[PDB]
Design a protein around this ligand. Structure first.
Ligand SMILES: O=C(O)c1ccccc1Nc1ccccc1
Ligand SMILES: O=C(O)c1ccccc1Nc1ccccc1
Ligand SMILES: [Ca+2]
Ligand SMILES: [Ca+2]
Ligand SMILES: [Ca+2]
Ligand SMILES: [Ca+2]
Lengths: 103, 103, 115, 115
């Protein structure tokens, strides 16, 4: 029901091994994981657990850029939303964009 | 070797049935098709045909928004690039962003 | 030292009268209110802070996208933006935070200048 | 009537001294040169055209991202942006075309005002 994908706009590649945390407004931690070699993170939650509510997806972009040797602006990339969801984040050192696609 | 994906940032959905044309700088038409129900367009070209060069991917966003009843700003969304490539476009009535991911 | 600019990708306009709240991370890792305001007719919010108030730390800029969309009769997926960054760590800088809004997406960038 | 603004998402700065070419679609469906210039220290390009020269039609704004990246020692995937739109069809408007640049991506939006 929820998938996160992270792309790197500087190197033109998936953003691999990026930590992603999901919170639900009571911020109860709700789910988390690290992106795969495809930049995707599957298996966050289950239908039973993902109820309507306000969620935040916080992507640890700072650790990502720091491991590449690039100084980043933001602490994170994110989307706070009211609730299949795909959340995608496109990363640059001084910018991000985040979208949701609900199918 | 080349895939195009188109997303709609207003309705939060894949952009379905969108015409996509690819050109190669001699603009020789090179490939084209329409996005599927997933917003994706597979099968554009072949390894043998997709040689290094300058390519333009032009997405007919105007026809897309007009069929939805929304007045759009642009004639198209696009990326002109020097050359697996995935080109993704995120559409709004007055904006687009386009990225490439090369894996 | 801190300017916020907000654009509307649905209407092709500045995002006018959008509420913007800035917070600073406190010692106890809570967010303490720092400064707030509304965008002007040009989409810009000037005068949030001063050089004397703008210390180093972790700042959060929250843009109230929900109210903006709702008031325009648009469905926001987006509750609010939360733009979070370390400021002034290596000395005073000027920051412009820009945000481009759509109902299911936003883009944000920073312009950092050394004054 | 036509302004272009360009930002750099790699460096967190305006994109300065970027070449911008504007073309207008001719009757034979070729692109005819219309106006061109370079961005300033603020990333802005003012003075492209005048109200008397800016007629209705299909315009293409090409931003030379390749040269900008190369000169900064960055690999551009991006050869150039091609931002294409119908202007002035229902009467004269003022347009701001903004572009946010990264090596493998760009975002663009329009601000349209009725003067
Ligand atoms: O959504 C995807 O599957 C995707 C695949 C390749 C490149 C970008 C992608 N997403 C997207 C593109 C532009 C802005 C924000 C997100
Ligand atoms: O339009 C501006 O004046 C502006 C100023 C500073 C930073 C970004 C800007 N616009 C913009 C923001 C995100 C995506 C595309 C365009
Ligand atoms: Ca409900
Ligand atoms: Ca070669
Ligand atoms: Ca310090
Ligand atoms: Ca007309």
């Amino acid at each position: 029901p929820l998938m996160v994908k992270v792309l790197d706009a500087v190197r033109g590649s998936p953003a691999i091994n990026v930590a992603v945390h999901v919170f639900r407004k009571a911020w109860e931690p709700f789910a988390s994981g690290k992106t795969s070699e495809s930049g995707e993170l599957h298996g966050l939650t289950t239908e039973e657990e993902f109820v309507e509510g306000i969620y935040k997806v916080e992507i640890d972009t700072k650790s990502y850029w720091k491991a590449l040797g690039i100084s980043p602006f933001h602490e994170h990339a994110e989307v706070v939303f009211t609730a299949r969801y795909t959340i995608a984040a496109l990363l640059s050192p001084y910018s991000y964009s985040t979208t949701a696609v609900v199918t």
